Structure formats: structure tokens, C-alpha cells
Scaffold this active site. Structure first.
Site, PDB file in Angstrom:
ATOM      1  N   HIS A  94      14.120 142.041  61.346  1.00  0.00           N
ATOM      2  CA  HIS A  94      15.424 141.429  60.970  1.00  0.00           C
ATOM      3  C   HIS A  94      16.017 140.476  61.965  1.00  0.00           C
ATOM      4  O   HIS A  94      17.072 139.916  61.694  1.00  0.00           O
ATOM      5  CB  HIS A  94      16.441 142.480  60.572  1.00  0.00           C
ATOM      6  CG  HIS A  94      16.992 143.250  61.725  1.00  0.00           C
ATOM      7  ND1 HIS A  94      16.459 144.404  62.127  1.00  0.00           N
ATOM      8  CD2 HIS A  94      18.079 143.000  62.548  1.00  0.00           C
ATOM      9  CE1 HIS A  94      17.170 144.875  63.168  1.00  0.00           C
ATOM     10  NE2 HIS A  94      18.166 144.015  63.414  1.00  0.00           N
TER      11      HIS A  94
ATOM     12  N   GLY B 182      22.725 144.126  68.910  1.00  0.00           N
ATOM     13  CA  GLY B 182      22.154 143.362  70.032  1.00  0.00           C
ATOM     14  C   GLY B 182      20.964 144.033  70.701  1.00  0.00           C
ATOM     15  O   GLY B 182      20.164 143.372  71.341  1.00  0.00           O
TER      16      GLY B 182
ATOM     17  N   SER C 145      18.710 145.589  68.962  1.00  0.00           N
ATOM     18  CA  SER C 145      17.675 145.546  67.961  1.00  0.00           C
ATOM     19  C   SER C 145      16.471 144.821  68.510  1.00  0.00           C
ATOM     20  O   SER C 145      16.624 143.806  69.148  1.00  0.00           O
ATOM     21  CB  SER C 145      18.177 144.840  66.712  1.00  0.00           C
ATOM     22  OG  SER C 145      19.307 145.525  66.205  1.00  0.00           O
TER      23      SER C 145
ATOM     24  N   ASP D 278      10.456 147.327  59.905  1.00  0.00           N
ATOM     25  CA  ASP D 278      11.292 146.365  60.625  1.00  0.00           C
ATOM     26  C   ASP D 278      10.550 146.020  61.922  1.00  0.00           C
ATOM     27  O   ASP D 278      10.891 146.498  63.009  1.00  0.00           O
ATOM     28  CB  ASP D 278      12.666 147.005  60.913  1.00  0.00           C
ATOM     29  CG  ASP D 278      13.702 146.008  61.396  1.00  0.00           C
ATOM     30  OD1 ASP D 278      13.419 144.790  61.406  1.00  0.00           O
ATOM     31  OD2 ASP D 278      14.832 146.441  61.757  1.00  0.00           O
TER      32      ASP D 278
END
Lengths: 61, 224
Positions: free
Chosen positions: B43, B178, B180, B87
Site C-alpha cells: 500500500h 508512517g 508501514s 501487503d
């Protein structure tokens, strides 16, 4: 540029998602993959996922 | 990173900081797995990405920095924004990083390496340090607990084979916005990728379980 407008308020539950207000405009960056769309808000400049049924295409671009 | 501490500078030399441009830019973590490949979350993809290796304070250019364009983004083909399953993304850099004391690669696990609930792991990143606080200028780290998959049942189609459940709900320590794309380390091995969690930052959060994706990583690296 693909512009959409929110028809309803929405309060994000996942940190990847935008919160917004009825009437807010969005540049759509990708229509998925899936039913949440990547979008940039024209009000706040934030980028994130929005639920596709909360928004509709603007009349003309 | 909420409830964390500032890292000893350059003690996690695999850490990558991502500036993603779409207008105004978004930011993520990631980590170096080969000299020209950075692993991150799916993402965090955008039209162009810049990776900064060797940083501690991301706002102060230093001697240790290596700053590289991404030339190709390999997002997992089955990533889905409704569930955020898979992800995971590999980023191929324009040039190979140089290995120094402040820039290094992190091993990723065997597919048979299935990390169980109950153990303590560490995650790092430059994300927000509170619900309403700015991103951290300095790299931060926190120790978190691996939870039984039952405790992430409020998350959509949480799949224990695909995803780790990270962060004792009785505490406030957590990865957040942030963070991620950043690695979760258990006993020195990258086991997890920060993926997502609650807007209010209440743990646990969902991390991608890297071990499941080992064959997919292999096929990207061998073709590139």
C-alpha cells in the site's frame, strides 16, 4: 485527472484510510485493486484508501 | 512508533526511508534485502519512489546517506485493498547500495520458519509517535509481543498463515502511520512487515508474515 465527490461523511477505522466529509473532492489514483480506492483529497492533500460507494464521479472534467 | 525509544543511530542499517510521489509526497519504511532491492508494504506504492539508506535523523543529510531512485515496483499480484491481504512489495533500486557500517541487508526467512505467538519482537520506523503527533525525525524502535490470531479477529479476514498479530492490547506500544513497510525482527531475523492497524492506534496491529512470501520473493530476485 479523475475527480470524485463524497456523498457521505466517513470516519476511517484503518490507519491506511482517509476520513472525509460529504462534499469533499478526490483525485482517484487507482480504482483498487479491490473495492477500496487509492485517492488524494483535494481539501487536505492526504493520500489513502476510500470506500468506493461513498463517492461518485463529478459531473464533467 | 508509539511508546518506543530512539534507536542507537545506525544500529539498524537495513532500514530504508521511502518518499512516495503521486503533487505532495507520502512516506513509508522498508528495509534492504539485497544491494538493489528494498522490501516494503504493497500500500506504499506510488508513481515514483525515492529510498534513503543510512539515515537516523531523516531531516539532516549525513555522511552515511545513500539516496537512490526506484526503477521498478513489484507489488504482489494478489494484493487487495478490502482485506489488505498480501501487503508486500519489492522495490528495485537504480543502482546497488554500498555496504558500510550504516547501510546493510537484512536476512529474510525460510518458508518453513513459522514464528508462533508469545514471543517478543522489535520494529522500527519514522512514523507518528501518537495519534495526533508528527512523524518522528529520528528512527525509533519498540519491542512488541506476538499475539494469538484470535486477538486480531476484529480485523477483516485476518489470516494467520498470511499475517502476524502484533502488540499486546493491554499496553499502548504499537507501530502506527508512517511505520508501514518497516520490518519486524525476532531473534535477528525479519519475520514481519508493518501493514496496518486501527486509526486510534490501539494494539494489536497486522503485519505481513514474510515467511509465507519466500517463494514469491525468490522469483522476483531471480528474474531481476
Amino acid at each position: 485527472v479523475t475527480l470524485f465527490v463524497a456523498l457521505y461523511d466517513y470516519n476511517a477505522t484503518r490507519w491506511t484510510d482517509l476520513s472525509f466529509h460529504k462534499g469533499e473532492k478526490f483525485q482517484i489514483l487507482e480504482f483498487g485493486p479491490g473495492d477500496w480506492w487509492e485517492a488524494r483529497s483535494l481539501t487536505t492533500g492526504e493520500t489513502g484508501y476510500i470506500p468506493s460507494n461513498y463517492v461518485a464521479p463529478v459531473d464533467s472534467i | 512508533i508509539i511508546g518506543g525509544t530512539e534507536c542507537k543511530p545506525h544500529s539498524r542499517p537495513y532500514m530504508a526511508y521511502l518518499e512516495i510521489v503521486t503533487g505532495p509526497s507520502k512516506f513509508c519504511g522498508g528495509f534492504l534485502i539485497r544491494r538493489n532491492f528494498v522490501l516494503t508494504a504493497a500500500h506504499c506504492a506510488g508513481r515514483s519512489i525515492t529510498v534513503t539508506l543510512g539515515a537516523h535523523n531523516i531531516t539532516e543529510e549525513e555522511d552515511t546517506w545513500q539516496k537512490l531512485e526506484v526503477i521498478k515496483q513489484f507489488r504482489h499480484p494478489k494484493y487487495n485493498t478490502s482485506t489488505l491481504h498480501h501487503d508486500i512489495m519489492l522495490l528495485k533500486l537504480k543502482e546497488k547500495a554500498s555496504l558500510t557500517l550504516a547501510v546493510g541487508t537484512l536476512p529474510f526467512p525460510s518458508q518453513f520458519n513459522f514464528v508462533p505467538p508469545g514471543r517478543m519482537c522489535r520494529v522500527a520506523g519514522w512514523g507518528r509517535t501518537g495519534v495526533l503527533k508528527p512523524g518522528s525525525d529520528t528512527l525509533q524502535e519498540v519491542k512488541l509481543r506476538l499475539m494469538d490470531p484470535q486477538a486480531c479477529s476484529h480485523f477483516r479476514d485476518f489470516d494467520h498463515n498470511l499475517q502476524l498479530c502484533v502488540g499486546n492490547p493491554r499496553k499502548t506500544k504499537s507501530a502506527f502511520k508512517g511505520d508501514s513497510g518497516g520490518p519486524l525482527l525476532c531473534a535477528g531475523v525479519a519475520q514481519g512487515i508493518v501493514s496496518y492497524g486501527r486509526s486510534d492506534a490501539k494494539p494489536p496491529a497486522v503485519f505481513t508474515r514474510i515467511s509465507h512470501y519466500r517463494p514469491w520473493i525468490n522469483q522476483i530476485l531471480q528474474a531481476n
